[PDB]
Amino acid sequence: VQLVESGGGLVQPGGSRKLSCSASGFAFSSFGMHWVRQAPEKGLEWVAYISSGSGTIYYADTVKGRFTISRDDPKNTLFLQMTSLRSEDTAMYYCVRSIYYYGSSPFDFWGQGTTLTVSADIVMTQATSSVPVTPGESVSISCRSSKSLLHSNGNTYLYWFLQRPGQSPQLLIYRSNLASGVPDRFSGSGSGTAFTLTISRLEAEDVGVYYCMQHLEYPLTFGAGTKLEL
Amino acid sequence: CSPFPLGALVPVTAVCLCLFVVGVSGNVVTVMLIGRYRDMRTTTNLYLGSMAVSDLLILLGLPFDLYRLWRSRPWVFGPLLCRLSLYVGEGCTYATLLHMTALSVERYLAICRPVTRRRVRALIAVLWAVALLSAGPFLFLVGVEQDAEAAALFSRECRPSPAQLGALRVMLWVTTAYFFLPFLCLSILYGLIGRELWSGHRQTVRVLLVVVLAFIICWLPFHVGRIIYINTEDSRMMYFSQYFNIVALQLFYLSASINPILYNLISKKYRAAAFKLLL
Amino acid sequence: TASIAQARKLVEQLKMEANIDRIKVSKAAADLMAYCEAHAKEDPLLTPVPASEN
Amino acid sequence: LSAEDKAAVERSKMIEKQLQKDKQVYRRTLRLLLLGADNSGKSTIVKQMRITSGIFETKFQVDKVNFHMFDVGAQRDERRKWIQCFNDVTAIIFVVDSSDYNRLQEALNDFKSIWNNRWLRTISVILFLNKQDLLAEKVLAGKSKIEDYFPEFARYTTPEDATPEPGEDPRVTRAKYFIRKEFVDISTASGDGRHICYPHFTCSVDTENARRIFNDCKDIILQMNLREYNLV
Amino acid sequence: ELDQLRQEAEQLKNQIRDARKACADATLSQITNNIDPVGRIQMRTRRTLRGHLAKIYAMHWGTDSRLLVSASQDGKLIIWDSYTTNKVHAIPLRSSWVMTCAYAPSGNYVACGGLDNICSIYNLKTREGNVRVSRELAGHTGYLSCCRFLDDNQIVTSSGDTTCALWDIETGQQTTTFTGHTGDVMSLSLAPDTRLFVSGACDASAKLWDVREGMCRQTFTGHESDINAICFFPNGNAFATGSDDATCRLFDLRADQELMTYSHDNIICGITSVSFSKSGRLLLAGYDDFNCNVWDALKADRAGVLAGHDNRVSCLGVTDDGMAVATGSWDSFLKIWN
Amino acid sequence: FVPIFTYGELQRMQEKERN
């Protein structure tokens, strides 16, 4: 699995630019694609979403109408026709794969991303923005949501992402359930409205910012981000 | 002066009752064998069951019609009853014709080849809808009773409307499409099936020949008599058309009653299921 | 020769089967009944649970 | 209904569409079973009819019709069990070398067991008498006669409707017709009109084997239609 | 020499018979004669799974009672979500004539077997997201009859070559071989402890096998035809075996003999699959009469009849929690009961 | 619907022939 984004550069306001990402090492047709931006010194924001076979497409309220997403399954590449660029649309976009089935782990792989230097919704909030901690001490991060994420089926649609300095976000927890490749030191538990991420023992490689996300509805909303200082 | 005096009416009534009983028994047996057994619910079996249901619905009209032709002066249970009496019968006739055409086409595509249950059911539903829509005008053009205070009340039974008779005429002239096209289809398809098989096979071609001959002899007189009816100009013409139309009625009921005899009872699986049900 | 080998194998197989501690049928049936009764309430098939648990 | 559930339902619908597409190829492809003893020349047919291993699949296409022929591999002679899987097939290709007068009884017993099977009661059997040249040579040389194996060969007479081939001696024709009659005697037994055998003569060099199987499959499909479509 | 060996074997068989008869102090039909009756257990089709292109032959429930895998001779293995009735994965098999399937207890791997004589293990947790062949276990000189996973690394397989083998997915070699049977093995049955398993073959007899020692300790007889199905009791001390004689028998490992017989003068069709409930009170068995009758394990009385299928019931499986039961048939449907 | 004349249309027709 590897995702290499291309098409970034300096574009004047109101211009047109199309980002292209090359997929390889996995079934690009079976996995759905997502676009998440990251403004400089800011948090993550969901841009759009496309299902397998271009059967289901959704856009965020801030990009609906202007930007359009398209995929090419035969060639195994993703396109993002970005028209009518604004001064506030400057951000680094990441291409993320996802698959939906019983036991799946959506948002498992995050691409390298590309930078584009131009020129009710469940709002997530975190009371702790910066928590300096020492190595080896058990760190506990708390999260708060405005709407109960507990669906009638009993599943909790909460996602935790860890973006280390100079690296793409990494999925830690997708539903208490531990993702593949993540050590067992991380653990998540909470109620329908209160969530807490507890670390058994922090290490030197655990430094970074923790971003939370809810997947109860299509308009995915990220959190403010909790950074840990060594 | 009376229509079809008692001299020849008693045999007509007797044969009508006999054909009605035979057709009702056959349709009931066919429906029971098709519903009770799952293996008897194939595409052709579904067509045969729908055709038998249509024929039975037509046979349920013999009662009322036997009453019209015996006593046409007294009431006919109101206009709505007659209108529906004429509409359900015409719709079931059109549905039977369309089902025969579809079964012939399916047999041709299956035997003369060099199928889906959903598709067959959708086609049957479309044919039923077309048959019910084509008979629509019969609910407004005809079926309305039409004529000392109570002596005045007598002499009333469905008759076509006097001013709208032209509409009924131009409609029955278009109804001929339900004869020429199915006749051509059945003839050509049976001829091709015989050329492929006969040139088991002998019995199949003989059954097909008997079926097409019965279809002709039973349906052509019906349309001929109806065309004569809409073309009545003289008194003797009407007198002859009365006999021609009662003969057409007898032939139509004979066909409706013998349909399962020619289609269902001739099959091996149908007879096997019938024997397994009775034992 | 394979015949003598198969014969000796079958002979040795019956010896291991004869020297087996076999308990009476009464105690085995009693144990089976006790096991079935110990889990009778925990069997959705034997006891139909309400529609809230299905 | 959460978004993950909707995505799962969409994937299920896509899988259903894929299965519906595969149905168009599965229902149209005709499956056939290839049976025969070790001495049978079925391998020569498989190698020439290309127009601890288990099942062997052979696929060929003639007249735009895709045929799938399967040959059993290392499975033992216990046929009553694994034969149930090959039911509902179009036909079963049964090849037997009629030139070996020694093991004809075993072939007849196998054909009787296959024809009188509880599960193959509605499956037809295509009989191919391979290696007719060796049979002709053996019956013309006079070294081994059929009377030494079957006592009825001396009393059998050639049918009146027998159309011999040009350049063939009457002895070879009589022998092959006697073998065909002996096979038909068991084929017609317990037939009940639900399955019919198709005796045919073929050889190792006969390239027309694909056409005979095609005609047999056409006839079987025609009979199945006549039965199902209420025409028999 | 051989004559003396056969005489000694006959004498040992007679001694074993006399010992089994001596321990028959009382039958199960007499002790359970005063127990309360089970009544009539009515089951209705809750979910109807369809999509297979050919006949369904085998199915198995995993650790989670929500996931379900079914095998069909069309060459496709579909994982069914019993709750949402959604198709999770589709595995295109290389060999269409599949006869069995297995679901690992961890839920990461699944196996299949048929006339190809090769057990192919498919990985479901591949990082690439596509189901691929993990190992092609070959070596059986016959069609594979049934496969069952012991753990995430070991798997036992049965074939019609009269021999069974214990495979190691890590290396792909037979760690243990069983050659005691005299007929084609049809189905296996793993104990809840995963230490012992009993199998039945066409020799009308079932023998208890050992995973480590690899030697048979007990041999059960009493059938008059081929044993097609076999299932172990939830406790692990007994098991039932189905045969084409339309008579199901219950055998106990501790008693080393039959305890009860399930038969009815109206049923003459053979048995294809046998299964037990969570507690073992109800015994479910599939018959060739297009129905699936439920028998009382302690009274042998028919507690119900399942006639939701229109073709031969080829398989039967009960969830680990007994919440629902699945019945597969050759009509390409897989209905869920309760 | 098989057209069959009624007693009413017989007398009407007869009265028309005799003017």
Q: Residue F14 and residue B235: Cβ atoms within 8 Å?
A: yes
Number of domains in chain C: 1
What's the CATH number of domain A124-228, 2.60.40.3080, 3.40.50.720, 2.60.40.10, 2.60.40.1190?
A: 2.60.40.10
Task: Please indicate the experimental technique that yielded this structure.
Answer: cryo-EM
- The residue among A176, A174, A30, A177 whose CA lies nearest residue E126 is A30
CA distance E257 to D145: 58
Helices D170-188 + D104-115 axis angle, to 10: 30
CA distance E79 to E63: 14
- Chain A residue with minimal CA distance to E68? A102
Q: Give Cβ neighbours of residue E291 (< 8 Å, ≥ 6 apart).
A: E305, E306, E307, E309, E313
Residues 139-178 of A with CB under 8 A from D: 151, 153, 155, 157
Resolution (A): 3.2
Identify any residues that bridge with A97 across adjacent strands, giving them in sequence order: A33
* Single-letter amino acid, residue E227: I
Cα B162 to the chain's mean position, in Å? 27
Q: Residue A102 and residue E88: Cβ atoms within 8 Å?
A: yes
CA distance A172 to A27: 22
CA distance B179 to B223: 8
Q: Residue E143 and residue D82: Cβ atoms within 8 Å?
A: yes
Nearest to C7 among E6, E41, E46 (CB): E6
Q: What is the DSSP letter of E95?
A: -
Q: Which pair of structure tokens corresponds to residue E88?
A: 């999770």
Cα B91 to the chain's mean position, in Å? 9
CA distance B113 to C37: 64
Q: Which pair of structure tokens corresponds to residue D214?
A: 């095609």
Q: Where are the alpha helices (DSSP H) in B71-200?
A: 79-111, 117-134, 149-153, 165-175, 177-197
Render the burial of C6-25: b for 16+ CB within 10 Å, e for the rest. Answer: ebeebbebbeebeeeebeeb
Q: Which chains touch D (3 or more CB pairs under 8 A)?
A: A, B, E
In chain D, residues with a C-beta closer than 8 Å to the C-beta of E87 are 11-12, 15-16
Q: Residue D52 and residue E138: Cβ atoms within 8 Å?
A: yes
Query: What sign results for the dihedral spanned by CA atoms B122, B123, B129, B133?
Result: positive
The SS3 call for residue A46 is: strand
The SS3 call for residue A16 is: strand
Backbone angles phi, psi at A153, to 5 degrees: -75, -10
Interface test with E, best of D9, D17, D52 (most E CBs within 10 A): D52
Domain region containing D113 = 28-228
Beta carbons of A23 and A15 less than 8 angstroms apart: no
Q: Do chains A and E touch (3 or more CB pairs under 8 A)?
A: yes
CATH number of the domain enclosing D157: 3.40.50.300
Within-domain flag for D77: yes
Beta carbons of B139 and B80 less than 8 angstroms apart: no
Query: What sign results for the dihedral spanned by CA atoms D71, D74, D77, D80?
Result: negative
Domain with CATH 2.60.40.10 in chain A: 2-118, 124-228
CA distance D72 to D36: 9
Tell how strand E271-276 and strand E282-287 pair up: antiparallel
- The residue among E113, E161, E150 whose CA lies nearest residue E135 is E113
Question: Does A180 lie at the interface with E, CB-CB under 8 angstroms?
Answer: yes
In chain D, residues with a C-beta closer than 8 Å to the C-beta of E202 are 78, 81
Tell how strand D91-97 and strand D124-130 pair up: parallel
Q: What is the CATH architecture assignment of A2-118? A: Sandwich (2.60)
A 10 A CB-CB count for E194 gives 16
The SS3 call for residue A94 is: strand
Nearest to D55 among E55, E97, E183 (CB): E97
Q: What is the dihedral of CA D212, D214, D216, D217, to 10 degrees?
A: 160
Backbone angles phi, psi at A179, to 5 degrees: -75, 165
Cα A83 to the chain's mean position, in Å? 23
Domain region containing C28 = 2-54
Length of chain D: 232
Q: Residue E115 and residue D85: Cβ atoms within 8 Å?
A: yes
Q: Residue A180 and residue E127: Cβ atoms within 8 Å?
A: yes
* Single-letter amino acid, residue B109: L
- The residue among E292, E169, E192 whose CA lies nearest residue E242 is E292
Helix (H) or strand (E) segment spanning residue E14: helix E2-22
Q: Give Cβ neighbours of residue B133 (< 8 Å, ≥ 6 apart).
A: none
**Which whole-number Å values give the CA distances from D50 to D57, E138, E312, in the listed order?**
12, 27, 36
Nearest to D232 among B42, B106, B200 (CB): B200
CA distance E61 to E319: 6
Residues 157-176 of E with CB under 8 A from D: 160-162
Beta carbons of D133 and D180 less than 8 angstroms apart: no
Question: Does C6 lie at the interface with E, CB-CB under 8 angstroms?
Answer: no
Q: Which pair of structure tokens corresponds to residue D186?
A: 């068991």
Q: What is the DSSP letter of A131?
A: -
Within-domain flag for D207: yes
Beta carbons of D212 and B97 less than 8 angstroms apart: no
- Chain D residue with minimal CA distance to B46? D229
In chain E, residues with a C-beta closer than 8 Å to the C-beta of A30 are 129-130
**Which whole-number Å values give the CA distances from B108 to B31, B260, D196, D226, in the listed order?**
25, 20, 24, 11
Nearest to E128 among A25, A101, A180 (CB): A25
Beta carbons of A69 and A79 less than 8 angstroms apart: yes
- Chain B residue with minimal CA distance to F12? B235
CA distance D135 to D183: 16
Q: Which pair of structure tokens corresponds to residue B30?
A: 């066919």
In chain D, residues with a C-beta closer than 8 Å to the C-beta of B263 are 230
Domain region containing B202 = 1-279
Question: Does A101 lie at the interface with D, CB-CB under 8 angstroms?
Answer: yes
A 10 A CB-CB count for C53 gives 8
Within a 13 Å sphere around the CA of A205, how many CA atoms are in the beta-carbon half? 6
Nearest to B138 among F1, F3, F4 (CB): F1
In chain B, residues with a C-beta closer than 8 Å to the C-beta of D226 are 111, 200, 204
In chain B, residues with a C-beta closer than 8 Å to the C-beta of F10 are 1, 3, 238
CA distance A66 to A84: 6
- Chain A residue with minimal CA distance to E66? A102
Q: Which chains touch A (3 or more CB pairs under 8 A)?
A: D, E
Within a 13 Å sphere around the CA of E33, how many CA atoms are in the beta-carbon half? 7
Q: Which pair of structure tokens corresponds to residue D232?
A: 């028999």
CA distance C33 to E231: 18
A 10 A CB-CB count for E300 gives 18
Domains, chain E, with CATH or none: 1-337 (2.130.10.10)
Q: Residue D82 and residue E86: Cβ atoms within 8 Å?
A: no
Beta carbons of D25 and A178 less than 8 angstroms apart: no
Q: What is the DSSP letter of B110?
A: H
CA distance D141 to B160: 92
Number of domains in chain B: 1
Number of domains in chain D: 1
Q: Where are the alpha helices (DSSP H) in D27-58?
A: 42-48
Q: Which pair of structure tokens corresponds to residue B233?
A: 């100009």
